Curated annotation (Swiss-Prot), chains A, B:
It comes from the Eukaryota. The gene is ANXA5. This is Annexin A5. This protein is an anticoagulant protein that acts as an indirect inhibitor of the thromboplastin-specific complex, which is involved in the blood coagulation cascade. The modification N6-succinyllysine is found at K288. Annexin repeats lie at residues 13-84, 85-156, 168-240, 244-315. Monomer. Binds ATRX and EIF5B. Interacts with hepatitis B virus (HBV). GO terms for biological process: blood coagulation; negative regulation of apoptotic process; negative regulation of coagulation; signal transduction. Transmembrane segments: none annotated. It holds the Pfam family Annexin. It comes from Homo sapiens (Human). PANTHER family: ANNEXIN, ANNEXIN A5.
Length: 318, 318
């Protein structure tokens, strides 16, 4: 097992040259979207940034506002994501959720549960460095009750690190996840919260196994996906995430594409945020648990230029 | 994988209660092995340094000098490896294979072939500081031929990023490895040094795949494990470590205990060094590739107090 994405460094890259294709593309005419497109998706994020630099030094123009005036719709909204520094992208998306795209647990839940401790720590740091306010306080401020609580637990980045596991605390803990299952996770939130937030990854993987031999069931079985409140969804995100991050995101991506209308906000966040970290893994995983390819899914459930960009990001292999 | 070791931090660590315990353990009273033994292998390494230091504030004795003057043979060499700082254990054993050892090409192969880039980067500089000379320049003076050359390449820590895996590039590598295979690795030479030492890992595992069906058989079968001088052992070891590190090391453990005698020195090096990184993982790949339990072979083949300490290091299970 080796984590990896779909966007690699362009060899032969020249800041100053790409700055010209782009300027020239959006020069006076309407717009060569097809050029903006193929280029920005066949560069990496650090290379995008240096084009952003070449643009200014050459032209006196801000690449980011130029793009943002000739592009619209789901197209714009993707391009704008690709130009965003990847150190920064998640802290950004959190703010949007904490401040103005709506009522926003799908994001808080999904970023917080799926980002490892190295990441939550960095996101927190940078959330405050960029945005002036601190991640934790914005979260407290716009959330509630036991959900708020566990986001706060996850957000500390303070899991017991990995060594030889206590089949004795495994037996207690699996036991207590059983009782809180039977009871619709509506009693002793107090208790399960730490089990899922402060325990380790392969404590919890052990635990989820001993869970099966208490109850005959996977822990996932306790928690339905349409209806549920906030908390249940956080639990089940934690759960799937402990088992496998690529796999959780592959899932999040299928359910972003099922249903009337559909979910471009998600498509975009996952695609872009993972483009240089694990996207290949998510893709091969998607072929694995859902048996049409990520590529194929997208080509059916997207249109026009946005569609094209997507697939280019996606690549093609598995 | 989640890579875990078998040694953890003792909760409620008392730096000097433990220092006392080592005093009356080895004082008067020439020695008392089983509290020495059990203490050191329930405390993590960095805690053993704290016990080493509170020993000096408290008593005016250098803990380590004391630990080794009351103890003999293999057990002694174990305690002396346990109280040797993580950062430093590797570079010390490189050195003691290089400085003065005889002709120890076995230890070089092992450490450089199993260590990741970031572990080699820390070795090189902590090596460089601790013994005034650079790890490379030493490696160079006592070795020669392509064995030297290949080591210098691995010694670089700069091997391609796991990325877009280029189908065309694979096949040319695999045929080049087919080419040099039939010629028993005795010639062509200089291109496989670049295939092994620089290709990206998710790349080199696909070449390992693509090769077999060119050749009939795995790359490994081209090389005769025991009837094979330095280079071919290195090469072999690199191939192995590319598929899985815990599995190289599991093979090296098995070959240290299987047969006539015991390679005790080797057994100490692996058990100790990897005890806080992947020892559980070496234990698990051990049982799956050899059908016995590491624990129960260290038993079958080692003796006395050395044994109980090893089995404590080895950890409780599976
Ligand atoms: C304390 O340990 C922790 C604490 C929390 C978490 C993990 C490890 C990771 N995890 C795992 O399943 C194990 C390891 N896994 C996580 C993703 C990471 C890959 C990755 C790289 C860069 C950016 C994002 C993801 C490494 C492999 C799930 C819960 S989040
Ligand atoms: C260019 O890369 C390299 C170059 C050389 C080598 C490795 C990685 C390690 N390796 C692999 O197959 C990569 C898998 N690997 C396991 C070790 C390490 C585990 C790990 C994870 C997180 C933090 C510390 C250690 C990194 C992932 C075997 C050959 S030596």
């Amino acid at each position: 097992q080796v984590l990896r994405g779909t966007v690699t460094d362009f060899p032969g890259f020249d800041e100053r040259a790409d700055a010209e294709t782009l300027r020239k593309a959006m020069k006076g005419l309407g717009t060569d979207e097809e050029s903006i497109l193929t280029l920005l998706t066949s560069r990496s994020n650090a290379q995008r940034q240096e084009i952003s630099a070449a643009f200014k030094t050459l032209f006196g123009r801000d690449l980011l506002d130029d793009l943002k005036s000739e592009l619209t719709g789901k197209f714009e909204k993707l391009i704008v994501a690709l130009m965003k520094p990847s150190r920064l992208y998640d802290a950004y998306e959190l703010k949007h959720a904490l401040k103005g795209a709506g009522t926003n647990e799908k994001v808080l839940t999904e970023i917080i549960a799926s980002r490892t401790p190295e990441e939550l720590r960095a996101i927190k740091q940078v959330y405050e460095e960029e945005y002036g306010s601190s991640l934790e306080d914005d979260v407290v401020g716009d959330t509630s009750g036991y959900y708020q609580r566990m986001l706060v637990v996850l957000l500390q980045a303070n899991r017991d690190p990995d060594a030889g596991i206590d089949e004795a605390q495994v037996e207690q803990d699996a036991q207590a996840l059983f009782q809180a299952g039977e009871l619709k996770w509506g009693t002793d939130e107090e208790k399960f919260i730490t089990i899922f937030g402060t325990r380790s990854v392969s404590h919890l993987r052990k635990v989820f196994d001993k869970y099966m031999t208490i109850s005959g069931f996977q822990i996932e079985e306790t928690i339905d996906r349409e209806t549920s409140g906030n908390l249940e969804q956080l639990l089940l995100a934690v759960v799937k995430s402990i088992r496998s991050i690529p796999a959780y995101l592959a899932e999040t991506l299928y359910y972003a594409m099922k249903g009337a209308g559909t979910d471009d906000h998600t498509l975009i966040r996952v695609m872009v945020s993972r483009s240089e970290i694990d996207l290949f893994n998510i893709r091969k995983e998607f072929r694995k648990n859902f048996a049409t390819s990520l590529y194929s899914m997208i080509k059916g459930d997207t249109s026009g230029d946005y569609k094209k960009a997507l697939l280019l990001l996606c690549g093609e292999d598995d």
